[PDB]
Symmetry: C2
Subunit: 418 residues, 2 copies
């Protein structure tokens, strides 16, 4: 409930969730969107227009998005009470309406928080962190063959050392944990027990299997070639090692994966395309080498929080796509797509920053709704504008003979290329 600030589109309808979490998407769906703080005023209108253009050229009016504006961050406090940085009404709107997109958000001053995005993650139980990575023709890249990178990283976001369970060194909290470890557990292998900060790395079967289960289903829902379990399990047998083993179980149990000629890898055939998927694993630090030497050999990646973070950032720099990084945070059904950059307060409203991040994360949204034809138009429009060197300042700094475009202008350049 809380239907007092959301103005539900009249010509809109709801996206719905059925068995297998498949999605029935009407041609006039309601998509909640959060404008985002700071430069959110700039990129979100451009996004809506670019998406509206792409949907409009692919289907010619048959399909159309009923944009509904929900509120979060500093705007929600000016729309809600000053205490409601994150309205329950907003959360109901994202839960009742499966799909939604959001821009960057300010962090509330002080408090037990350093991000509002984490507040949404915690409160909606968003445990997958999707981050596709590819090269766009014309983007300056530091590697000789950036076009060989075409991966989707599925990163767990509820577990691992990022949970935040940690205690300061030299603190009574730490000593009670440290001595408990050395007294009752027989913990050795610690080199310095005094003035020692401690952290906990939890990796469960549920949190592990619901990630790989999402990563595998994306491999068949999009007809991808392989799924890789990235892990540092040879040194952490029971967390990252347990992640791998649990990951291999899901493939065997819930997708019909057989041992490929004796393992350690597995493979099954897509039930809806007949193509041979592969389920393999790679050691984390080795993976960082592989993406430089043989990136063409990897497609979908399933990994833990820390590994996914380091791996996605490395790939982003590899394709010169740091500033245009698409991203999505998923639950069992809820799917929230986001721009990965900050709010950039100093440029707010000035129509300068790059909307590519939010635009491409919107391409994920369309891809996730089955509207792959509209999504391809966003990709084509992206390749077009960048190849033409009509880009925002961030790219113009790195190109020779480039044309500076504003945020809205760059969006229009995309629309003209699709």
């Amino acid at each position: 409930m809380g239907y007092q600030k959301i103005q539900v589109p009249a010509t809109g309808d709801k996206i719905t969730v059925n068995a297998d979490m498949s999605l029935s998407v009407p041609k006039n769906p309601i998509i909640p969107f959060i404008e985002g703080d700071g430069i959110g005023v700039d990129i979100s209108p451009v996004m809506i227009k670019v998406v509206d253009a792409a949907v409009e050229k692919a289907y010619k009016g048959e399909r159309k998005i009923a944009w509904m504006e929900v509120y979060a961050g500093e705007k929600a406090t000016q729309v809600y009470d000053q205490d409601t940085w994150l309205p329950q009404e907003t959360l109901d709107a994202v839960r009742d309406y499966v799909v939604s997109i959001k821009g960057p958000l300010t962090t509330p001053v002080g408090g037990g928080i350093r991000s509002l995005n984490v507040a949404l993650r915690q409160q909606l139980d968003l445990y997958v962190c999707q981050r596709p990575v590819r090269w766009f023709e014309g983007v300056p890249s530091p590697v000789k063959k950036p076009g060989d990178v075409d991966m989707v990283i599925f990163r767990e976001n509820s577990e691992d050392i990022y949970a935040g369970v940690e205690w300061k060194a030299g603190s009574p909290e730490a000593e009670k944990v440290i001595k408990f470890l050395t007294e009752e557990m027989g913990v050795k292998k610690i080199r310095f027990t005094e003035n020692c900060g401690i952290g906990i790395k939890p990796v469960s079967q549920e949190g592990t299997k619901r990630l790989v289960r999402k990563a595998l289903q994306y491999a068949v829902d999009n007809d991808r070639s392989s799924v890789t379990l990235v892990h540092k399990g040879n040194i952490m047998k029971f967390t990252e090692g347990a992640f791998k083993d649990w990951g291999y179980e899901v493939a065997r149990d819930e997708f019909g994966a057989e041992l490929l000629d004796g393992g350690p890898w597995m493979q099954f055939k897509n039930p809806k395309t007949g193509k041979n998927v592969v389920v393999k694993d790679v050691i984390a630090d080795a993976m960082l080498q592989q993406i430089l030497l043989r990136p063409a050999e990897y497609d979908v990646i399933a990994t833990l929080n820390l590994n996914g973070d380091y791996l996605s950032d490395a790939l982003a720099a590899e394709v010169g796509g740091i500033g245009i990084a698409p991203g999505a945070n998923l639950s069992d059904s809820v799917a929230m797509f986001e721009a990965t950059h900050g709010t950039a307060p100093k440029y707010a409203g000035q129509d300068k920053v790059n909307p590519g991040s939010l635009i491409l994360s919107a391409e994920m949204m369309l891809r996730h709704m089955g509207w792959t034809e509209a999504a391809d138009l966003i990709i084509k429009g992206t390749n077009g504008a960048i190849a033409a060197k009509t880009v925002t300042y961030d790219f113009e700094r790195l190109m020779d003979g480039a044309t500076l475009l504003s945020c809205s202008e760059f969006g229009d350049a995309m629309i003209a290329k699709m």
Copy 2:
């Protein structure tokens, strides 16, 4: 004090450690060396000659190394009892003679010692893992400008998750630590309490400062432009974040660093040059991007175990130097330089593999003894041979118009161009 199977050089002298942590290097130092198993027979003799050539060519007879052979690994089982893969006498020679060089050793076995190298690092208090990385002219690289990489990574290797403090999921020990964490510590940030593997991440003050200290002094003993503390502290304030702050403390404490241009970074000045050194910090996942985009702005790196592992692997692939990676493990005084690749059993004794790894780790040894000129001769000879296209099989197969050389001849090719 042991003297059973070891023959002390007659013309040898001993390296000593005095106050001020300085290293006393005489005119004829004694260097223990382990030949290493497998392909150790190939690279170690080639190394000894190349070092001998550099020492006497750099210094016209003034200096010469008295090579003393200590035993470890398989050969230690034939010269000693066949059960003593690691003689206690060997450790005495490395501790009394702080400097020493080492070949590859067999690793797999997963006993409470996962390798023989860990037995050395644990029984010798080796807490620094030095790995210089640079590009050599002509080496095939996956990046456009490999020459911009010229870094030295200081990686802690005694602490962090790599300690091995972990408990299996669904195990009474796990439930015992969990039910202790969730009940007595009030931990609620864990998402799945059942079937959950746990690991402990310890980062102490002493273990942190003795790395950053050895990292800072290397910056002054070799006049490197800056030292960067790589950390994931924005999410782990009490472990990685505490590593950051502790690292900045050392700068104020034992090197005289004061803030610059409003911080957060810092600057001091070596008493050897007076040129303005910089002590900065970068977030780990951002660092993986920086080494691809702006590698020219980083020189010496001090970081944690896991980060250092990922960072060194990324740089190695970046310069095409995976197979020729020099490495050293250091203590307060004990310094053991080693080849970083495996034993390559199939290739043992056949005089094929690349000795660049052991040769370049010997360049560190010379650099560490103050013999910077002899160390430079090995570098000059390395660029020459590689630029000259006289290379071993590993490089020959990836180059066009390349000359196949064996291991021993490649060593001679270096000497002929220093």
